[PDB]
Symmetry: C3
Subunit: 145 residues, 3 copies
């Protein structure tokens, strides 16, 4: 019964170690049987959820004196615990086939068990370009299985 | 009971055409019409599509992109809104000419769909899309 | 209760289909069985099956990676293709010092009878990074 799909991808928090923020109202964005708080999908009904997130990614250059790669991730928060558990993580960049401005896309999807009160957040690590389209192309939702 | 569908195969044309009956292609509670998935029952659907891309070019490197998306056609406004969209750099100058490259774009998400509404899969420069295997390129959905 | 399963990446001991964790942490089997890398269908029906694999390397071999979900009936030897993707995460002319990472996700609805198996196979699994069960996993659920 419960499900949700969010878009928006406010990247204002990522710099200071915060998760992405998402629209829950406008357009295809919706909450049904789930809650939302400060970028987190809050679970109301306990059980197995198929969680998913897609992140549209951009880059202005692709060199590696050291290394440039992006880390897309779905994480679990348990309110009484300081730790954000890695649930579904992808390490990604088309820089593997590079020698330039680029596009890439990260999809994460998986069935995880969630409890009432637990939250799920999306973090994108080391992003260097946010196009006007990134917020709406990127999305993050789930549905109870 | 629950409506579900998985469309194998592929062909070129805007929208992409799909197989419906042959092989892993199936329709249960869902309809299909000329590159478009048609809904019978209203409700929330996890729709998905994977597109296999391949070529022997890519002069423009990572600047050469591929847009792959799911689009909903509605009568509330006779237009298509892009729902789930993926734009990727499928290759770069790292692959020489006369050398094959591959890439794959997956999309999946939950949208609300009324009865009679249609969803198509569209890809920028379908000249690169590789139809030949339906396991490599497919488009399906299922209600939540 | 709706059958579901999520298997996490474990050290695969080139060696055939990938092996998975089924109990520890994010790994679980509910209504679904497991046997030597294969998810086993106990209750016939339609399943959304999914698999993600994390790929990474230094420089580049050759290099095209094939990531695929396959089906097999324990009576018959052949494994039928279900969901396959081909990627070229690196080029033969990329910097030999370039450390690259690319993820491959596959998801799709398939019909499965009772007793049938679903496996994940990757061409050059040496390029698969199974350090994290969060980076490489394989799950499914009945629709
Ligand atoms: C991101 O969120 C903060 C707090 O609501 C807001 O000040 C800022 O304008 C937002 N950015 C965008 C583009 O939505």
């Amino acid at each position: 019964n419960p499900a949700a799909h969010l878009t928006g991808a406010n990247s204002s928090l990522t710099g200071s170690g915060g998760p992405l923020l998402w629209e829950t109202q406008l357009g295809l964005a919706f909450l049904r049987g789930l809650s939302y708080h400060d970028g987190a999908l809050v679970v109301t009904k306990a059980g197995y959820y198929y969680i998913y997130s897609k992140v549209q990614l951009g880059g202005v250059g692709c060199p590696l004196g050291l290394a440039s790669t992006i880390t897309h991730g779905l994480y679990k928060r348990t309110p009484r615990y300081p730790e954000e558990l890695e649930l579904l993580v992808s390490q990604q960049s088309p820089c593997g086939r590079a020698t330039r401005v680029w596009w890439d896309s990260s999809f994460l999807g998986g069935v995880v068990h969630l409890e009432a009160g637990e939250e799920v957040v999306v973090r994108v690590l080391d992003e260097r370009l946010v196009r006007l389209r990134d917020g709406t192309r990127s999305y993050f939702g789930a549905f109870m299985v």
